[PDB]
Amino acid sequence: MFINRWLFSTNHKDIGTLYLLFGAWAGMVGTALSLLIRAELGQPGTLLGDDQIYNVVVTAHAFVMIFFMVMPIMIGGFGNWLVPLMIGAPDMAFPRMNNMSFWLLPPSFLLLLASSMVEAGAGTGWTVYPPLAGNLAHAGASVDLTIFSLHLAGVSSILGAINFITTIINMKPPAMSQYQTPLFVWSVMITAVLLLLSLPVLAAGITMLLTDRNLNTTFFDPAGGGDPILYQHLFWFFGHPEVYILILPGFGMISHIVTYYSGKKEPFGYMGMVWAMMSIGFLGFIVWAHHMFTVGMDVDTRAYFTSATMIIAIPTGVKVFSWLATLHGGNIKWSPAMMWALGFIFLFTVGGLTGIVLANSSLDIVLHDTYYVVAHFHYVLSMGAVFAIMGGFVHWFPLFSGYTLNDTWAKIHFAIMFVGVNMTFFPQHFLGLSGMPRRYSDYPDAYTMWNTISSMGSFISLTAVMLMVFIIWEAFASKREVLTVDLTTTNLEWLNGCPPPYHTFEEPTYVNLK
Amino acid sequence: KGDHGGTGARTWRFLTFGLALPSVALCTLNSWLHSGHRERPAFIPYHHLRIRTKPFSWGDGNHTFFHNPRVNPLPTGYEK
Amino acid sequence: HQTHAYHMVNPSPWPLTGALSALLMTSGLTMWFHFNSMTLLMIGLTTNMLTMYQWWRDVIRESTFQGHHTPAVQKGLRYGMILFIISEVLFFTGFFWAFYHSSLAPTPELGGCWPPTGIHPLNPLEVPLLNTSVLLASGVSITWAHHSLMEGDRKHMLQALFITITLGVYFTLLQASEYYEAPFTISDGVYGSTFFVATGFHGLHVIIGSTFLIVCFFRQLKFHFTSNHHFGFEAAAWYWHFVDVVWLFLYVSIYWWGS
Amino acid sequence: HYEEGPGKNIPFSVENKWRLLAMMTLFFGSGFAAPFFIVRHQLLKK
Amino acid sequence: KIKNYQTAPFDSRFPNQNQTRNCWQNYLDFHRCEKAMTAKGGDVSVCEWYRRVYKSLCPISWVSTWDDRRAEGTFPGKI
Amino acid sequence: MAYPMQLGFQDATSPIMEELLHFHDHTLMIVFLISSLVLYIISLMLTTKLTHTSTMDAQEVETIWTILPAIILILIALPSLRILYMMDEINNPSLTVKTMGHQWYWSYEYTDYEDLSFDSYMIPTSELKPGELRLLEVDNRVVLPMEMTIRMLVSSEDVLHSWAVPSLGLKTDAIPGRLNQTTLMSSRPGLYYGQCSEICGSNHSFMPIVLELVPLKYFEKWSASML
Amino acid sequence: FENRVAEKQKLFQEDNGLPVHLKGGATDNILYRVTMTLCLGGTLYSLYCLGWASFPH
Amino acid sequence: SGGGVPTDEEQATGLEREVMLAARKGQDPYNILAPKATSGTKEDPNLVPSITNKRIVGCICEEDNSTVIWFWLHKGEAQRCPSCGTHYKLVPH
Amino acid sequence: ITAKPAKTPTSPKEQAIGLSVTFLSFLLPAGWVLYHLDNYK
């Protein structure tokens, strides 16, 4: 029974639970890697005495946090648990293929571990650019194991995208149009379309890297007429959609959380929120070269990519202002999930504004490959994603488990994390403006003060992560079972009780046309 | 060109046997008529060709997967 | 008892065996490229084939033999196959991007020209044109097969599907011979790299598509398809037209314009 | 069928809170410890 | 002709950030010119402008590799 | 170079970097307008027990909050693009200098007249002379004439690197097989520091750039003495 | 050939509680055990190879 | 042409065949169609079939509303949408 | 939300034990590795 249920699953809730457990474990790995980064930088000099190892830690930090923590939690965990419930569907369209999307991830993560254990690791950056990642500067198996890890994670997510698009298009009640589905469901559909289109381009690029390393191709090698910059275009043609894939489900969850704890039946400006996510999805394919402003790019191309990148703040702003308009007039409930969502709005706004600074290619010349970029994305993406994940985890933990958290402990956890992440990343703006490069294991002495503060911040967030594990333990240890949940008339995922039965919507909802 | 009414099974069989397979037969003629080995060019050890940055994982490491001794020189030239 | 039309699938081991097959194929390729051993790779290829066989066997059991493919389920499988094809188009787009990048701006090491100095392309009017006629003809014959099935005609469906498969096999054998006869190789700089990786992945998809047509041929021999319900045949035909269209873009781009 | 309800729709037991603490300790502690041991491993090769 | 040479001037054929083809073209031009002069008897001095431009722009290792390949018979450009 | 506790950009050494500072100040004035506006508005939404939970009509306010951001973006874009096209303007250099990245050092070639080239490596910490800067000094500085337009050409003989000098607003990737051009003009004599800015392996943190800007006549005699 | 789909429909609809991947009979169980043994055995072997390759030789 | 290809009438089975036969009779036991609303007064409530004693209703109170209002409808006296008041009555079994 | 009182209440002492064990599970192994870094180097 245990194997049938948990290794042979065809159930969207159990698969969602598997993804949440996997993603929480990966988040411990990715946090430990981030603390090694900050320990190496927390005083001047060398800590590891091996900067190849430092570079391997940085590279694996980003792959773990992106491919094994955020994407599995947002899309595999919250998407599988919540999407079918929010449309009244009995499961996903392809419930068995869904289980393979999950089970490809432990082997993908094993390949990434393997890459770091063999030879000297892949000390490449998560961009994996050649020729550093080629077979002369990274001879041996580490980079190929990293490529294969990415291939498996890509297949997992492409099949998952197929599943989500199909389920959301085909399995709603017959009377429910796409403009009657909740915003989280929209955010997953759009994320899935971005995955479907972008991950095959990454797969092509990393396969060309694999063949340059092992089959004597020269896609990226000038000796054969190849070009390192071609790899960067293929990588970033995926990688820009990827940053929106990482945040879009978070936007969906934030819309639900802000609406719920405002005591509202609906988000402000629903169609504008759909418009904004669709626009971000579409424009997310035409801006990638802003990751390449220093490669030797012609001025008119720089001007185009600057302008297209600026156009994206418009639909993103409709979403920030619409979250503020949802709060307006609300019966505000200061629950821990609401605190996470308000933290998200603040931090995402800070990070999006420093992205606007970066969009100007002339300023980006001076800021590229410095800690100002690291500060932009740890606000707008890394901590935007983590605060939306924690808001959604706190808000929906009683649905998934049937038990309540201790809200006082959850508010203490939020307070510690908010101090920690701001102490960690805010000073990195100053480091970047004053010229400290990213991807460095040590720094000229002038940069000591802000690196020291940033590293002390990183230990505050460690304390918060340890406390989060205790908080989850205390909830399962005390077994406070949920009774009543407010606002079920506009939050269908709760209407089957906590936790919902294994099969839900065996009799579908009744929705008429009128 | 013409019919355009029903595109049914009978029309698609008519197109298969009346246009598609005759085309394949004509191109098969055209090909098996220009076939016949052509003189291999002087070997020149150009550096952008016969790339070897890592031995191939088969054979002696130095032969491509569908190596044809008649027309594929090694980095050192044609085989004897 | 359910009162919706969707399919709750029995708990299955094939997702796990497929995931493990992917681990074994990739760790196997690593072992082959770096540790001079084919052992893991051969295990992974075997378990991958076993997984595909049993998973798709079970889908036939669920549909032809158990009746779980209601119109709603079939509609989801249509979207799933269309979206899968879209992802494969974007995979090829990356290799077309590589090809145009390198051939539109040939670097000094090539001689600053395309085709590079020392490269002697195949004549596109010889076997490449024959291959084009073969795949176009197979798109006509598969359309005959489809209409025969819809019209209830077993014999002509089988004849037309057999002709389609024969043409797919003809393309594959012609392409294998062209690979052997080509004077340039995958190691012949970016011309060889783009040519063999892009045509090579295309050839893989021709083999996959031909295999799928063969599955459909044997299912047809066993009377699985009705004149109105035969989504495996439709999916194989859509995949086969995708393989044809990818070939037309390779022929125009790499063989013709790139000569 | 399968068990349903709180504490039953999860692949780990919560019947005993102290056994649960041990299991959660090993689970999250193994993920957090792994990078430190990988670093140790790489340093010990030099 | 125009001597007072400080460095290679702006060339509208190569207005952008990648100047690889500028180096390459002047190297080819100098060597084509040199060939035409040393053969038809004349003076390579008429080739001098291309020499100065490619020597200004081209990395030493590129020039050295290209010279080695011309000697070996493996230079892939046309001279 | 940066100094301890610095918050913003290094002081400008070239007119282009001065332009960037003024444009960054402009962008920041706007950034601080938007940030404080958001903070003030969100705080307002969160500080009343008055409620209004019925459906709210959206279209009017969505016009305000699309059109205002679009106007702001145009107010950033216009000076941004002017600086971009100004940095692109031909300036007629007096000198061309190449730099080749390597793991892990830079080489320099000054081949307009004579065959002058040398390598430039970080001074190890144990060998710094008293008062020299850890991780920033080199053995052989890039001596250049002050007050003159210089074309730098940047490439690499192995992996990617990136040649950067923040106080001159310069960062140009060094890519094998590619010759990237940038121009440099220092308004002042002195020593201007940068660091390799594309991860290139284990010693990426330790291959810095030091420009030494002096009058032409001293650059000429230095060049001759380096042959 | 003859249409024997009805016989297979009867077989795969028999009310015997078997999941679809085993409902054909004992051959399914054999093929399943072969596949799972190769997968789990191969996975252990891959872990062995990782152990081997994690150290210099 | 010739024959030899089975029809759905001959060979469809299981749930597919159930849906096909019900459609011929104009019935929708597997909920493939959206039900059409009545006037929804207490005299003419919307009639909600169920195989049990409760079913979830979603009410799109006005055409084009993006918010759906969801509630359990139980066997017994008709209930009203909590947003618009339109009436629904469960018709079990 | 409303909920039942805990089925198995976790007293302040029990929470101090769970918190201490949780923190030690993260701190002791990493602390051992970092304390011994120079030994590895």
Ligand code: HEA
């Ligand atoms: C969640 C992930 C995420 C998201 C959403 C974003 C969103 C944005 N990013 Fe960021 N970015 C990253 C993750 C993300 N980014 C990562 C990981 C990298 C580096 C990758 C690497 O190199 O490793 C990076 C790097 C990166 C660069 C390259 C810098 C460099 O390498 O030198 C640039 C350049 O333009 C950029 C810009 C932006 C912009 C303009 C947005 C916009 O989408 C933001 C829009 C949001 C707002 C603007 C705020 C809300 C709006 C209002 C309140 C309205 C009014 C506003 C105005 C009028 C301006 N990003």
Ligand code: HEA
């Ligand atoms: C989602 C993405 C993500 C996240 C979450 C993080 C989190 C952190 N990052 Fe991240 N980081 C990157 C993505 C991310 N990073 C990327 C892409 C790079 C660039 C790599 C390269 O240059 O190639 C990078 C690089 C980078 C650097 C620069 C390295 C260099 O340039 O040399 C630094 C430096 O301080 C840093 C620090 C941190 C810290 C201290 C944290 C965290 O410790 C902050 C606090 C957050 C947590 C503690 C998260 C906990 C969440 C969980 C545990 C999940 C729980 C799950 C459930 C409840 C279900 N990161």
Ligand SMILES: CCCCCC/C=C\CCCCCCCCCC(=O)O[C@H](COC(=O)CCCCCCCCCCCCCCC)COP(=O)(O)OC[C@@H](O)CO
């Ligand atoms: C370097 C080498 C790396 C190698 C990595 C290899 C990784 C993976 C190993 C793959 C093992 C495959 C095993 C067979 C999978 C069959 C999936 C399938 O066919 O899934 C179907 C859905 O997807 C559909 O249709 C449409 C989708 C069909 C997808 C079929 C599988 C494709 C796998 C690879 C494709 C990747 C994309 C490449 C382009 C980037 C059916 O869905 P189920 O939920 O099962 O059933 C639903 C029931 O109602 C059916 O009666």
Ligand SMILES: CCCCCC/C=C\CCCCCCCCCC(=O)O[C@H](COC(=O)CCCCCCCCCCCCCCC)COP(=O)(O)OC[C@@H](O)CO
């Ligand atoms: C090293 C490489 C390893 C080998 C690679 C793969 C080799 C060959 C695989 C060839 C693919 C065979 C697919 C067989 C599918 C059989 C099952 C099937 O066709 O199932 C049909 C449903 O379609 C379905 O799920 C459709 C689902 C199938 C989608 C398949 C698409 C191909 C995917 C192949 C993987 C590609 C990866 C490429 C990466 C470069 C059943 O419904 P119907 O037909 O309506 O019948 C019911 C009627 O009888 C009722 O009256």
Ligand SMILES: CCCCCCCCCCO[C@@H]1O[C@H](CO)[C@@H](O[C@H]2O[C@H](CO)[C@@H](O)[C@H](O)[C@H]2O)[C@H](O)[C@H]1O
């Ligand atoms: C169902 C689960 C299946 C698990 C299967 C487990 C397989 C266990 C046997 C492993 O066999 C290894 O394969 C290697 C292949 O590399 C051999 O290397 C040898 O053979 C190679 C091939 O030429 C060369 O590397 C050398 O000759 C030599 O070291 C080596 O002797 C042998 O130990």
Ligand SMILES: CCCCCCCCCCO[C@@H]1O[C@H](CO)[C@@H](O[C@H]2O[C@H](CO)[C@@H](O)[C@H](O)[C@H]2O)[C@H](O)[C@H]1O
């Ligand atoms: C970034 C994540 C890491 C964050 C901070 C970790 C905080 C430290 C927790 C304590 O860790 C322990 O510290 C002891 C020292 O206090 C070590 O004992 C060591 O030192 C002792 C005292 O000298 C000896 O008694 C022991 O045998 C010797 O192992 C012990 O091994 C280690 O487990």
Ligand SMILES: C[C@H](CCC(=O)O)[C@H]1CC[C@H]2[C@@H]3[C@H](O)C[C@@H]4C[C@H](O)CC[C@]4(C)[C@H]3C[C@H](O)[C@]12C
């Ligand atoms: C027409 C469409 C859907 C309306 C509906 O059917 O409910 C609405 C939804 C969001 C609207 C857009 C957003 O509100 C954002 C923009 C607001 C500007 O005031 C007009 C253009 C603008 C781009 C709007 C155009 C149009 O009214 C949109 C696109």
Ligand SMILES: C[C@H](CCC(=O)O)[C@H]1CC[C@H]2[C@@H]3[C@H](O)C[C@@H]4C[C@H](O)CC[C@]4(C)[C@H]3C[C@H](O)[C@]12C
């Ligand atoms: C035996 C069978 C009759 C089918 C049936 O009604 O059972 C017939 C009808 C169509 C025939 C096939 C088609 O005519 C196509 C092929 C024609 C080749 O000449 C022989 C094999 C070939 C594949 C045939 C084999 C066999 O004779 C088939 C399959």
Ligand SMILES: [C-]#N
């Ligand atoms: C952001 N890109």
Ligand code: CUA
């Ligand atoms: Cu050289 Cu970084």
Ligand SMILES: [Cu+2]
């Ligand atoms: Cu981007």
Ligand SMILES: [Mg+2]
């Ligand atoms: Mg860079």
Ligand code: NA
């Ligand atoms: Na350090």
Ligand code: NA
């Ligand atoms: Na059809």
Ligand SMILES: [Zn+2]
């Ligand atoms: Zn209503």
